[PDB]
């Protein structure tokens, strides 16, 4: 089926169905992926190179986006997100209510992977 279980950085066309590539860096080649290899001119940035026609599926990271990302210096970093959201992404494992704003929630997960996009 699909060459990835999830993808943080899916580059897809706006078509029915979408034509997608997953730009996520991988540290071992997924059993689902037919070929891994370099991307972006960096021989050390290896991706699943498969093109997929169909819906790219869910994200891997714990937050759709994040305005208040706190990351380490590695590439890829380990980030957490102290955004107070109405609802945590289903991919967040530990979602707790906020002290300051009790109608809101905080996802306290740490995630090793690419920096999430800004919400605003």
Structure tokens at 118: 């800004």
Helices then strands (H, E): number in the chain? 0, 11
What experimental approach yielded this model?
X-ray
Say how many Å lie between the first and final Cα of the chain, rounded: 34
Q: At 75, give phi and psi (nearest 5°).
A: -125, 105
The Cα-based distances of 27 to 70, 79, 91, 117 in angstroms read 23, 18, 21, 22
Quick check: 37 and 47 in contact, CB under 8 A? yes
Structure tokens at 46: 């290896």
Q: What is the CATH number of the domain that holds 14?
A: 2.10.69.10
CA distance 68 to 116: 10
| Whether residues 26 and 75 fall in one domain | no
CA distance 95 to 90: 10
CA distance 55 to 13: 10
| Whether residues 44 and 13 fall in one domain | yes
Question: How many domains are there within the chain?
Answer: 2
Q: Domain residues for 33? A: 1-60
DSSP result, 23-77: ----SS--TT-S-EEEETTEEEEEEE--EEES-----SSS-S--SSEEE-SSSS-
| Whether residues 114 and 65 fall in one domain | yes
Beta bridge partners of 39: 42
Length of the chain: 120
Final residue before a domain boundary, out of 45, 60, 75: 60
Neighbouring C-beta atoms of residue 75, cutoff 10 Å? 10
Final residue before a domain boundary, out of 9, 30, 60: 60
Quick check: 8 and 24 in contact, CB under 8 A? yes
| Whether residues 87 and 45 fall in one domain | no
| Whether residues 7 and 49 fall in one domain | yes
């Amino acid at each position: 089926k699909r060459p990835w279980k999830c993808c943080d950085e899916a580059v897809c066309t706006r078509s029915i169905p979408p034509i997608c590539t997953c730009m996520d860096e991988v540290f071992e080649c997924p059993k689902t992926c037919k070929s891994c290899g370099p991307s972006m001119g960096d021989p050390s940035r290896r991706i699943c190179q498969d093109q997929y026609v169909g819906d790219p599926g869910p994200i891997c990271r714990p937050w759709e986006c994040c305005d208040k990302a706190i990351c380490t210096r590695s590439n890829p970093p380990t980030c957490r997100c102290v955004d107070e959201v109405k609802k945590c992404a289903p991919t967040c494992k530990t979602c707790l209510p906020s002290r300051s704003r009790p109608s809101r929630r905080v996802c306290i997960d740490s995630y090793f992977g690419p920096v999430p996009p800004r919400c605003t």
